[PDB]
Design a binder for this molecule. Structure first.
Ligand SMILES: [Cl-]
Ligand SMILES: [Cl-]
Ligand SMILES: [Cl-]
Ligand SMILES: [Cl-]
Lengths: 226, 220
């Protein structure tokens, strides 16, 4: 029931700064270390630094001491990662992780990890998505199985989340990695395979959430006879 | 700084088979005082944060199944999975916590090997809503195939298209071990309305010959 809850996705402009937060619960915040780790797309983990929330004292990797500053607020059980003077190399996911403080030592593995915070560094503005239905062609329903979906188009930055029928429909769902279009905006599809006989009868709604733009959209997908 | 090195960078193994993967450090992680190796392994599944798997080189974390075993000492360590299951696909990375700055290996990507599965192909004409906005996106879905390598080509009135499509592929499914793929053809409304036949042609190991899924605009 130990958990570290991280702040949401950040879009920040080159040269400016960002603060990532890590709120601990289910344990005594001041009795374990908080570690911070960087992960760039599909690449290895890099250790940034560590803070003792009881004393407030941080220790940095020499690779990050100018880029990163660690603080902790005891009253709110929250640790913070401040990143400064940002560049495109700072676009990454930042994890906080807990590490034991047993036997008076900081030399420990990392036993509980937050979900990560995505930071995108860019001069482009936030933009919410348009959501379009993906209705199968007739022959894309042959043989008793069909597919349908939603196209989540022209948004910035990543990520979006997509569910179906408010989470009741999970079987056969595929939500694809977004691609960056030549406009500099992302486009993503989510699809689900369903019995072809159900296209007339069951309601299918994709639930789209783009938290950077505070955009929430539910789109009902219907078949098109054409 | 200590350098952590992992091999192989990736491997594929069938369900039920044994896998071993290697982690080395540029200097010894064995502390003479307490005879412990300051070495951990993490598992990172797609869409997820790293999860602690092994520490002190050979201690399983609470709740980790016993088919995961860590071994080794000093500078040479191994992670063994005795009988791989379909849900074990992940990147496995090691970490030394012996010396600041703490450092991680680059990870071993474990992929699941299964029998060949041809894709099921579906195609979606653009919606009337989108067409009102001046653009037409045509989407082709390749569902539940294996192996990952697949080729998609778009044809508009049998003219091969270049430069106007993008695609992306899911991570491997943790249950049936397949992949899926989505490709989007983007045209202006004006161009969409000037042509009749929209086709995605799919090449894959499980298909004896390429498969074309197509529709005619306005018959669809
Ligand atoms: Cl968020
Ligand atoms: Cl907007
Ligand atoms: Cl209709
Ligand atoms: Cl298990």
């Amino acid at each position: 029931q130990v958990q570290l809850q991280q702040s949401g996705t950040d879009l920040v402009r080159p040269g400016t700064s960002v603060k990532v937060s890590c709120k601990a619960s289910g344990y005594a915040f001041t009795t374990y270390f908080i570690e911070w780790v960087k992960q760039r797309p599909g690449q290895g983990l890099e250790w940034i630094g560590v803070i003792n929330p009881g004393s407030g004292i941080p220790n940095y990797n020499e690779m990050f001491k100018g880029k990163a500053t660690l603080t902790a607020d005891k009253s709110s059980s929250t640790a913070y990662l401040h990143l400064s003077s940002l560049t495109s190399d700072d676009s990454a996911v930042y994890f906080c992780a807990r590490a034991p403080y047993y036997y008076g030592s900081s030399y420990y593995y990392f036993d509980v990890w937050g979900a990560g915070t995505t930071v995108t560094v860019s001069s482009a503005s936030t933009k919410g998505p348009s959501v379009f239905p993906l209705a199968p062609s007739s022959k894309s329903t042959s043989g008793g199985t069909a597919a349908l979906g939603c196209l989540v188009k022209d948004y910035f930055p990543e990520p979006v989340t997509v569910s179906w029928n408010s989470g009741a429909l999970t079987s056969g769902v595929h939500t694809f990695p977004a691609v960056l279009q030549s406009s500099g905006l992302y486009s993503l599809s989510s699809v689900v395979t369903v019995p072809s006989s159900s296209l007339g009868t069951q309601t299918y709604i994709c639930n789209v959430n783009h938290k950077p733009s505070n955009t929430k959209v539910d789109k009902k997908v219907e078949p098109k006879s054409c | 700084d200590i350098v952590m090195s992992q091999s192989p960078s990736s491997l594929a193994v069938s369900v039920g088979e044994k896998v071993t993967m290697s982690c080395k450090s540029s200097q010894s992680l064995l502390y003479s005082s307490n005879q412990k190796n300051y070495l951990a392994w993490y598992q990172q599944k797609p869409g997820q944060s790293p999860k602690l798997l092994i520490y002190w080189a050979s201690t399983r974390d609470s709740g980790v199944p016993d088919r995961f075993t860590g071994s080794g000492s000093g500078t040479d360590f191994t992670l063994t999975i005795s009988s791989v299951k379909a849900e074990d696909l992940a990147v496995y990375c090691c970490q030394q916590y012996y010396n600041y700055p703490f450092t991680f290996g680059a990870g071993t990507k474990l992929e699941i090997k299964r029998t060949v599965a041809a894709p099921s192909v579906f195609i979606f004409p653009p919606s009337d809503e989108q067409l009102k906005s001046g653009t037409a996106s045509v989407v082709c879905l390749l569902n539940n195939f294996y192996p990952r390598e697949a080729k998609v080509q778009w044809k508009v009135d049998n003219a091969l298209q270049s430069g106007n499509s993008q695609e992306s592929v899911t991570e491997q499914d943790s249950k049936d071990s397949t992949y899926s793929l989505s490709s989007t053809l983007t045209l202006s409304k004006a161009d969409y309305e000037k042509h009749k036949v929209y086709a995605c042609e799919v090449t894959h190991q499980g298909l004896s010959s390429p498969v074309t899924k197509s529709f005619n605009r306005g018959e669809c």
